Amino acid sequence: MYTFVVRDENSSVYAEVSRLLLATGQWKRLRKDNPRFNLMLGERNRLPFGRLGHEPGLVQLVNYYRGADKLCRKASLVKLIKTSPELSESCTWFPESYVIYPTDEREVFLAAYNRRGNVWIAKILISSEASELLDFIDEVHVIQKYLEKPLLLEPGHRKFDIRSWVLVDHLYNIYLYREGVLRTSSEPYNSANFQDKTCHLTNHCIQKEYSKNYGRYEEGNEMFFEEFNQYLMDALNTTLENSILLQIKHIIRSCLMCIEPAISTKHLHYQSFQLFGFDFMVDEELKVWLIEVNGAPACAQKLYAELCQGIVDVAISSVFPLASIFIKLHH
Amino acid sequence: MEVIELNKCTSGQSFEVILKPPSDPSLEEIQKKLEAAEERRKYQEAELLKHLAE
Amino acid sequence: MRECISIHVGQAGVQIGNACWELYCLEHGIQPDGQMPSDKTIGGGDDSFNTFFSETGAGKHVPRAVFVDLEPTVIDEVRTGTYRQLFHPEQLITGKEDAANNYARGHYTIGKEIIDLVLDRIRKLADQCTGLQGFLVFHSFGGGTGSGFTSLLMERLSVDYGKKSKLEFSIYPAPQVSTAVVEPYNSILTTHTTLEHSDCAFMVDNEAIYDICRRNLDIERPTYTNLNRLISQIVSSITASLRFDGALNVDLTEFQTNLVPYPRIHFPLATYAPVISAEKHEQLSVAEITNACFEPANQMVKCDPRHGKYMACCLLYRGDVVPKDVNAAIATIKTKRSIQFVDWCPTGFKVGINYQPPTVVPGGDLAKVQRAVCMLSNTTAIAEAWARLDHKFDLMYAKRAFVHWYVGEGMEEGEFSEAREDMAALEKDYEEVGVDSVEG
Amino acid sequence: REIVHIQAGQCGNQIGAKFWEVISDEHGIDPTGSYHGDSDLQLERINVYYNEATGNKYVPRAILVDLEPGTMDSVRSGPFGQIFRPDNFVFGQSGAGNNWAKGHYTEGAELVDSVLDVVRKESESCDCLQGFQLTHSLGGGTGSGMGTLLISKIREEYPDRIMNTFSVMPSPKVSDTVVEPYNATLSVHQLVENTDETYCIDNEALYDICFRTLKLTTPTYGDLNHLVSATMSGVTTCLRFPGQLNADLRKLAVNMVPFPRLHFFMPGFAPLTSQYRALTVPELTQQMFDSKNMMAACDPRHGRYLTVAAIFRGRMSMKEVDEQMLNVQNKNSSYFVEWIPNNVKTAVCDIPPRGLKMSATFIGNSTAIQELFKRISEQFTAMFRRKAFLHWYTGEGMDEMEFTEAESNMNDLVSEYQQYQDA
Numbered sequence A: 001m002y003t004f005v006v007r008d009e010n011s012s013v014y015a016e017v018s019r020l021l022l023a024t025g026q027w028k029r030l031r032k033d034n035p036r037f038n039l040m041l042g043e044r045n046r047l048p049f050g051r052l053g054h055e056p057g058l059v060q061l062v063n064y065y066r067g068a069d070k071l072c073r074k075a076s077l078v079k080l081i082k083t084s085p086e087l088s089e090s091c092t093w094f095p096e097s098y099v100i101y102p103t104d105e106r107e108v109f110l111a112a113y114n115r116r117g118n119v120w121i122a123k124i125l126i127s128s129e130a131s132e133l134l135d136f137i138d139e140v141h142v143i144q145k146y147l148e149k150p151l152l153l154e155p156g157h158r159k160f161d162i163r164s165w166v167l168v169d170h171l172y173n174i175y176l177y178r179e180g181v182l183r184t185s186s187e188p189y190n191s192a193n194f195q196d197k198t199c200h201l202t203n204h205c206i207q208k209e210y211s212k213n214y215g216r217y218e219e220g221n222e223m224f225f226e227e228f229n230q231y232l233m234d235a236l237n238t239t240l241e242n243s244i245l246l247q248i249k250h251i252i253r254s255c256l257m258c259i260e261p262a263i264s265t266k267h268l269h270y271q272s273f274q275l276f277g278f279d280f281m282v283d284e285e286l287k288v289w290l291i292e293v294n295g296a297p298a299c300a301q302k303l304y305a306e307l308c309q310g311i312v313d314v315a316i317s318s319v320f321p322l323a324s325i326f327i328k329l330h331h
Numbered sequence B: 001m002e003v004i005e006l007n008k009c010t011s012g013q014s015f016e017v018i019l020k021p022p023s024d025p026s027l028e029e030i031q032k033k034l035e036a037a038e039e040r041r042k043y044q045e046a047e048l049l050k051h052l053a054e
Numbered sequence C: 001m002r003e004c005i006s007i008h009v010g011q012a013g014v015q016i017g018n019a020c021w022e023l024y025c026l027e028h029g030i031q032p033d034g035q036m037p038s039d040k041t042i043g044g045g046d047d048s049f050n051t052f053f054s055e056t057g058a059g060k061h062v063p064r065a066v067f068v069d070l071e072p073t074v075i076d077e078v079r080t081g082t083y084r085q086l087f088h089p090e091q092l093i094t095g096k097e098d099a100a101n102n103y104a105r106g107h108y109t110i111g112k113e114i115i116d117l118v119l120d121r122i123r124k125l126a127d128q129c130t131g132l133q134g135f136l137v138f139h140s141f142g143g144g145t146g147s148g149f150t151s152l153l154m155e156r157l158s159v160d161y162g163k164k165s166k167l168e169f170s171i172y173p174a175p176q177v178s179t180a181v182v183e184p185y186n187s188i189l190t191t192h193t194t195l196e197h198s199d200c201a202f203m204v205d206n207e208a209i210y211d212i213c214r215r216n217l218d219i220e221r222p223t224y225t226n227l228n229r230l231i232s233q234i235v236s237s238i239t240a241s242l243r244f245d246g247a248l249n250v251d252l253t254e255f256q257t258n259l260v261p262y263p264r265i266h267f268p269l270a271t272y273a274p275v276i277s278a279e280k281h282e283q284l285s286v287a288e289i290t291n292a293c294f295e296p297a298n299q300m301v302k303c304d305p306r307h308g309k310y311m312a313c314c315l316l317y318r319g320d321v322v323p324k325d326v327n328a329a330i331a332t333i334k335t336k337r338s339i340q341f342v343d344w345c346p347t348g349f350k351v352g353i354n355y356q357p358p359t360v361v362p363g364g365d366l367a368k369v370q371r372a373v374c375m376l377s378n379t380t381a382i383a384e385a386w387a388r389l390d391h392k393f394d395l396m397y398a399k400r401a402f403v404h405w406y407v408g409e410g411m412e413e414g415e416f417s418e419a420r421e422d423m424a425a426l427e428k429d430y431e432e433v434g435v436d437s438v439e440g
Numbered sequence D: 001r002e003i004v005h006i007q008a009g010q011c012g013n014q015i016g017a018k019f020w021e022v023i024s025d026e027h028g029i030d031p032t033g034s035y036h037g038d039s040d041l042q043l044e045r046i047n048v049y050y051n052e053a054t055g056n057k058y059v060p061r062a063i064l065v066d067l068e069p070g071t072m073d074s075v076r077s078g079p080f081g082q083i084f085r086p087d088n089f090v091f092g093q094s095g096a097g098n099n100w101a102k103g104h105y106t107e108g109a110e111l112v113d114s115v116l117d118v119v120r121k122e123s124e125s126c127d128c129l130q131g132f133q134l135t136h137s138l139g140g141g142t143g144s145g146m147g148t149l150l151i152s153k154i155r156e157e158y159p160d161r162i163m164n165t166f167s168v169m170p171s172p173k174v175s176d177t178v179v180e181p182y183n184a185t186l187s188v189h190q191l192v193e194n195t196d197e198t199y200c201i202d203n204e205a206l207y208d209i210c211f212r213t214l215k216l217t218t219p220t221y222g223d224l225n226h227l228v229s230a231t232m233s234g235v236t237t238c239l240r241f242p243g244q245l246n247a248d249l250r251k252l253a254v255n256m257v258p259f260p261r262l263h264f265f266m267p268g269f270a271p272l273t274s275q276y277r278a279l280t281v282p283e284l285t286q287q288m289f290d291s292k293n294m295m296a297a298c299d300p301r302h303g304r305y306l307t308v309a310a311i312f313r314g315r316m317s318m319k320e321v322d323e324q325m326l327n328v329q330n331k332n333s334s335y336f337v338e339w340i341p342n343n344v345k346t347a348v349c350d351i352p353p354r355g356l357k358m359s360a361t362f363i364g365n366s367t368a369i370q371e372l373f374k375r376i377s378e379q380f381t382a383m384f385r386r387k388a389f390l391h392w393y394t395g396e397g398m399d400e401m402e403f404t405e406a407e408s409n410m411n412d413l414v415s416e417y418q419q420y421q422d423a
């Protein structure tokens, strides 16, 4: 039959993928170090891509793109955007950012700073004074313009971020999962003091720990597309597709097409797919900003089943067939 | 992109393209190691013949 | 004119040597009986082909070559084959029984008993050289003779010819092409012992050769003849510069000068195109074959150069190629491919063009093409093949599996771990040269 | 190059004779030693097992040994009986009475020098002796006791030559005397120390194959021996026929034996059928890994493979072979040790054995073989705890302590297999 190995016991997503594979009767889980596998669900760090694709007779597929880290590390993304001509130092959907060592951009940062609303975020410390930000780093970091004018949900005057799940298969087809999540802040937005992190950081952990009336407006501080689109209709006379999702699809395509020559496994002796988590901000003019790309993302609890099944159909069974919830981003 | 050191003959040619500038054991020692391995073989054979003699 | 002596060790070395010298004779118009009608100097000369062939009074052109094997059946094929008349009997050296896939047997036990005869026969070739450059050494990593006797011979050659260059053509083991189970052991033992004695070594992974034969030549079950005729094309394009008029890689020293900035990191990656089935074809352009040099599927070792760094890069063209086309191809590829050099090296290419197109063996599997290219690039990516080999070593050695066969031939267990620590150091050298730090 | 074949005692000589019948037919040698084949492939490596006599006759490099003349009289009258060198029959008159001590210490000791004289004469005219193969049973007296005495003396005289045995293990299901577990326990310790490879042929497995698979209601020793000679022909194909392999005995042992004492192999053969039907490659591959085709009565699913050789014979798709070998390895993924990479060798030889378009010989170095030694050990202990039948051996000068040590040695071997089965 088909064989696979599990090398990331901490992956919520691939625990479910592996759980699904076994329940087809046509996949078998081997010990972690058995080289004779079809599918490797690999470790996050130091994955031995150099040992893949040398087993005679075995087609071998791994759930990570070697080289995708360039997009999934904070400093790397900044360097990639400024130095890739298809993205360029000009690109409009990425906040002005700088790589600062405690190749270093400490001097060009202060230049643009003096040219100035002058609030930045290093990464966490949000401050309006440069001196505070640089002393924090010495205690590799990126300093990024902080979006002082976010889109605030009502009621609550509350900041949020959008997570989009993207699956890139072995043919470099780019599949955007139909379902995204808004991860919302519970405490209202306060431009006067960035000292209080709870309403400036929409991290699900930070809301669960620091915010009273967490879960007040939506369950687990998570809002899904059906509700959000309905909100944008009622409050802004627009839709999620028109005001936001067109920009999100553009940004995903630009990022992944930019690195395709460096990471594509077409004509390689092994094949890759990978699931990505893209995080976006939306400002008050309904402009969408990329914040970061996650190379090993988790999923929202109510979306695990659908998306993990989708991974099996689109990424695994397309290579190893047995005996659409995605939007295909053309390119 | 510059071509330097262009040499031509009737058999072919050669040149360089620059796109960007930048920014022993003695004979005695070997024979010792080989003789040592021989002696270790001889020792192991002698142990075998001693075992067989028993 | 400066001479080169070829040494072929073990079955893989001998059978590849046969394929090369056959091709050499075809490239130079030397018939199997050693006669070269086009050579107007009878009994002598200092032409470019005389670096590989001496001459007798009867006008016979004799390979400057010695064949060494610890059992006679492979070299017996040489003595009775098409090119039997080419070689003197003194050049073909056989023992009685082989190294049984056992490095320790090739190096210590049997090697000690035949090493002085081999050297004497090499000395006789050397005495016929007005200005010997050094040696080309062909062998497998995995065979007991190819691994164990080669490393002993390389040590003695450093003693007896201290100022001479030594280049290797080494067959790296792949289970698709009949291997012994102990070939990882033999590969590490011979690399450890030979490393300080080799100036430049061209690894050829039987996996890549096999797959090129399956995919490009459409040969379902490639034979040793299939593999070896393909290997000999790559060898021949690497050695063409020694055997023909030219200005790039004209002596063995230049290989090191051009491809090896750091001594231990002396394993360039070779990539060859085009390989076309003779049973077919549209002629590929300079741009197309140069682009093919950055396809993993045309490399002699499967690895991903996009995820390493270059230290040097030589493009060796054969056939209808003019410099202007090469620059137009390189300009294109540089804007499309991930070609990153290390910071202390010029981002550039040394280019050699030889106007004669590849010669192919009549009746072989390779079609005649109008232009071909062999790229030699010293990339850290080739360390992937060390990592794979070292991992297989580690699995077996943790249980000391098969070690008793090596200890039984007089090798100490400590030679295993010494060899493996050296390989670990080698992997660390590539890592320092080639990787930017990743953020936690 | 040359191999010297020895066959000792009743079982050893009856299986030996069939081996020479089978491989003489394969090399085109008739019963007069005259070559009448039609392919140079038959003669390319004929010298491994045959000498060339002056009259263009080929004579097996074979020494026939027994402590009574009966079986060797039967060989000489047999089908190919005239091919053997008459000088190479070495026999006494006493017999060994199914008694290892008679074979090893008393009767056998009187004859062994004469056998070594013949071995020496054969070795002396070998251009480059590979080593020795011995066929014998472990349950009798001559093959078991004299055979292991012979192996020990040969090792003393030729310490650097390979020694292989094809050894028939006794089973109470196919038994001549009750002392067989004594004789086999004494012999096994000899083999642990003094062979490089031992093909373990279990008479229980042979009987069960004849009865259950070949549908032979009343198997005979001849029916058992047809299986063994077919298997022996298959394991030696890589020595006898020009492949691309370039294998000799030392290479075989290096590649199959990762630890010096664990050199006891389960052989197998396919097809065994109760026939003109075409056997496909999937069927061949599936059969040769089926426990029911194995000739050591051990379940491989109870242990793990250290090393495996799979030798296919006949004209078949190499591509089909590899696909099936990969498939069968998936089905048995848990039964191969993961710390010997690429520990399954596939070999193909184009010459089919007589009467089959294709076939497959299996050679497994499996830790499940420990079941065979446990079986013998239990039967040994059931008698030895009451000292039953021991007088037959103490009457030949043996002491009870030598039985204690042999039993301890076998239990050690079992523990060794169990150590690697759990690695």
Ligand SMILES: Nc1nc2c(ncn2[C@@H]2O[C@H](COP(=O)(O)OP(=O)(O)OP(=O)(O)O)[C@@H](O)[C@H]2O)c(=O)[nH]1
Pocket (backbone or CB within 6 Å): C009, C010, C011, C012, C013, C015, C016, C069, C070, C098, C099, C100, C101, C102, C106, C139, C140, C141, C142, C143, C144, C145, C146, C147, C171, C172, C173, C174, C177, C178, C179, C180, C183, C206, C209, C224, C227, C228, C231
């Ligand atoms: N490409 C190629 N590989 C070969 C050839 N012959 C053997 N090999 C490979 O070489 C390795 C085996 O080593 P050999 O060269 O045959 O062995 P050897 O040097 O003669 O040493 P021993 O026979 O063990 O004494 C395996 O990895 C084979 O796949 C050949 O003609 N061409």
Ligand SMILES: Nc1ncnc2c1ncn2[C@@H]1O[C@H](COP(=O)(O)OP(=O)(O)CP(=O)(O)O)[C@@H](O)[C@H]1O
Pocket (backbone or CB within 6 Å): A095, A121, A123, A144, A145, A146, A147, A148, A160, A161, A200, A201, A202, A203, A279, A281, A291, A292, A294
């Ligand atoms: N330029 C910017 N302007 C405004 N808010 C920002 C920002 N950069 C980051 N944030 C806020 O900080 C939070 C966490 O940012 P970021 O995603 O960089 O850290 P992180 O990687 O630890 C969380 P995750 O991995 O789940 O995306 C985001 O939810 C966002 O609200």
Ligand SMILES: Nc1cc(C(F)(F)F)c(-c2cc(N3CCCC3)nc(N3CCOCC3)n2)cn1
Pocket (backbone or CB within 6 Å): C101, C178, C179, C180, C181, D235, D236, D238, D245, D246, D247, D251, D252, D255, D256, D307, D308, D309, D310, D311, D342, D343, D344, D345, D346, D347, D363
């Ligand atoms: N009777 C036989 C026959 C063979 C043979 F036919 F050669 F394959 C073998 C065997 C096993 C093996 N293994 C490697 C992985 C573990 C088993 N490697 C080899 N060879 C033959 C000579 O080339 C080297 C490998 N040979 C053993 N016993």
Ligand SMILES: Nc1nc2c(ncn2[C@@H]2O[C@H](COP(=O)(O)OP(=O)(O)O)[C@@H](O)[C@H]2O)c(=O)[nH]1
Pocket (backbone or CB within 6 Å): D008, D009, D010, D011, D012, D014, D015, D096, D097, D098, D099, D136, D137, D138, D139, D140, D141, D142, D143, D144, D168, D169, D170, D171, D174, D175, D176, D180, D203, D206, D221, D222, D224, D225
């Ligand atoms: N397979 C097989 N087993 C035999 C044959 N003859 C005897 N045996 C077995 O061998 C053992 C008896 O040993 P035997 O060779 O007859 O005694 P020996 O002459 O003293 O060596 C018992 O296990 C018998 O079942 C035979 O021809 N074939």
Ligand SMILES: [Ca+2]
Pocket (backbone or CB within 6 Å): C039, C040, C041, C042, C043, C044, C045, C046, C055
């Ligand atoms: Ca001349």
Ligand SMILES: [Ca+2]
Pocket (backbone or CB within 6 Å): C158, C162, C164, C196, C197
């Ligand atoms: Ca030197």
Ligand SMILES: [Ca+2]
Pocket (backbone or CB within 6 Å): D110
């Ligand atoms: Ca007497």
Ligand SMILES: [Ca+2]
Pocket (backbone or CB within 6 Å): D113
């Ligand atoms: Ca005597």
Ligand SMILES: [Mg+2]
Pocket (backbone or CB within 6 Å): A292, A293, A294
């Ligand atoms: Mg993150």
Ligand SMILES: [Mg+2]
Pocket (backbone or CB within 6 Å): C010, C011, C071, C098, C099, C143, C145, D246
């Ligand atoms: Mg050999």
Ligand SMILES: [Mg+2]
Pocket (backbone or CB within 6 Å): D010, D011, D140, D176
């Ligand atoms: Mg009997």
